[model samples]
Target: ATGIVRRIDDLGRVVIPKEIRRTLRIREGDPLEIFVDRDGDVILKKYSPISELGDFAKEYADALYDSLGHSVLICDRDVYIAVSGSSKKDYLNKSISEMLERTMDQRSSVLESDAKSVQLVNGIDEDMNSYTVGPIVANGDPIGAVVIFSKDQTMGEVEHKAVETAAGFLARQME
Candidate 1:
């Protein structure tokens, strides 16, 4: 057959033919990645947790930057996937501070004020005065983090909640 046609059900379920499913090795409960391409075609593939998270970060980078009015970093484990705002170019593939790193290890959120005293590496500018890191947990385990930084502002409840909300969004992307 050249192609197969299927209709989406009321619940939005589109059943793949058994033969096609077997040929593609797509099993029940398997995750799939879905996106639109530059050519304006929808694409789907077997889901990769890391790449999917990276895509999610790239898709939302501008919104995060505009919402927080600070630098935003979307990291998988210790590696940066996306960065935006001041010194943003210096952070990709770089590890974050030990304090922020601990957020992933401890599966918790952390906020550090007066970051100039902490000495972050990987060319993170010394002018950054506040940092907030929150764990992105998926399947009951911490898989990554969302970090936000400001040059001269102290992180408050609003900022803390923003980071936490971003982390939650990242976690949902994994699911």
Candidate 2:
């Protein structure tokens, strides 16, 4: 079930050899979880309860899509989709892209040159919330982020702590 490392295609597809699939009981439609450890080694595993929780975040994000509602997205530094909601896909391509760009631009500055745990806020719509996006750190480094769209003027101490907690828990599950 081991093979040489391969990059995903432009279409975001990878061919899993049949032998591995058969050995792992991985069938079509089965989910896979991919992670990179602190050493930058790629790890892959069959979707389990932990991975399912990660998938649940994606489902949760998808549920946020609404014409009058807000959406949340969590992405890695590369901007790869870690989790995305249904509510704001179109707006993201339009409005959110700029937000991400700005966020990415300011990352080093706010992150204390660590480039991790940096927060970005974009005012979307009339009642824009702080919309906290921070690096999801594990083992003292960032793996991804926990993005939350809220109506509060600022994330404040409580919301900030909550998202941090959630991000930690999620990151543990991810690893």
Candidate 3:
């Protein structure tokens, strides 16, 4: 294991170094979890609220895909956690786009009728398609989102309802 030492300040705040932060993509205002072990070591952990659901999210995404006949995805603040459909390898475990993060911060949803609008991942390497984004807010905090998209057709009311209701379910699930 690699170790680095930092001292807590007068206010009881320890600043994680820039290198560590960047390595983990631990941005400003990110939630953190702390733990004390029986060995007397204090451990600091990154807190991803949606992770508590385990594979429930993966099952949710697959179920959505099965019913909706399109791709479905769920993400936490940092990365894509669940995805379904043929192109699954493209976004699973990928870092999210800044736009998604911004949407999360605003606790707002996104609906793009036009293709090439939803930048699901960080890069613009591929063209986007019709997508619905439902920002997941739990306990009054913006955490992540649920996305449904169809490359073959324009997404409308049904997709919108899926995102909205799915987001709400996750919100309640988390809280």
**Candidate maximizing lDDT:** 3
| Per-model lDDT | 0.72, 0.48, 0.83
Q: Model 3, clash count?
A: 1
What are the RMSD figures for all models against the true structure? 10.4, 12.7, 2.4
Cα misplacement distance, residue 122 of candidate 3 (Å): 1.6
Estimated TM-score per prediction? Answer: 0.64, 0.40, 0.85
Q: What's the true lDDT of residue 160 in model 2?
A: 50
lDDT string, candidate 3, 58-123, tens digits: 998989988988888899987889989747688888888888888888787777878575577887
Name the lDDT value of residue 166 in candidate 2.
55
lDDT of 2 by residue, 63-165 (tens): 4333214345655432334344434443332323445544433431111212222223234433444565555554444444556555443544554554555
Off by over 4 Å in 1: 1-48, 119-125
Ranking by TM-score: 3, 1, 2
